[PDB]
């Protein structure tokens, strides 16, 4: 085995096999990027803004986002609003019955590190302590522009998923 090998963040296609694998990866990531099914988790002041994305100013259907509010059909989950002590096992359970190519995004400032209720008694100090969240959407009314930007950030991460290229174990 070579003592030097390029990092998977730094590698380029050089074999014709790699061109085939990269284009196939692009098709898989591309269908994953376009079709995009979150689940309606939203519960509080951070849920009306989720509906504001469904509003006819900042449409999500033109992005392909649609709320199949059924976690078995969901790709990802948008933790939105505050997160209490009393709810949190239900949050874990809703995370459990999701299919494997999943993500979860922390819309809202209460949803990461407690936010405005960081010192309350019956509150989870951000949804880090329950589910592994990959993108945070900051903003206490986390802006529709910002929420969509969080989705585009996540979609850039989706473009760098490399599900096919890792069969060659790069």
């Amino acid at each position: 085995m070579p003592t030097d090998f390029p990092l998977p963040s730094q590698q380029k296609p050089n074999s014709a096999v790699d061109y085939t694998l990269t284009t196939l990866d692009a098709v898989a990531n591309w269908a994953r990027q376009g079709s995009f099914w979150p689940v309606t988790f939203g519960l509080a002041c951070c849920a009306v803004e989720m509906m504001h994305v469904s509003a006819p100013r900042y449409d999500q259907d033109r992005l392909g986002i649609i709320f199949r509010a059924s976690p078995r059909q969901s790709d990802i989950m948008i933790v939105a609003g505050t997160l209490t002590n009393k709810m949190a096992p239900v949050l874990r359970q809703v995370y459990d019955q999701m299919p494997e190519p999943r993500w979860v995004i922390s819309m809202g400032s209460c949803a990461n590190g407690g936010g405005y209720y960081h010192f309350s008694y019956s509150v989870v100090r951000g949804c880090d302590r329950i589910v592994p969240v990959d993108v945070y959407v900051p903003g206490c009314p986390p802006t529709s522009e910002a929420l969509m930007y969080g989705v585009f950030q996540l979609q850039r991460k989706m473009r760098n998923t490399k599900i096919t290229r890792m069969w060659y174990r790069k």
């Binding site: 949190a88 096992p89 874990r92 010192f119 329950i130």
Partner: protein, 47 residues
Amino acid sequence: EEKRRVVYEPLELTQAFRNFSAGSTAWEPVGPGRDDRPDSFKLPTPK
């Protein structure tokens, strides 16, 4: 992770809570204030 469930462990903060009511004047700086008691229903003075 290992119990595959959430557990209830006693409190640990990243940042200790800081109130700031330690800076406070003892006497309430509002004055005594006038009354609005009706002249019927306060006590008549003697004589």
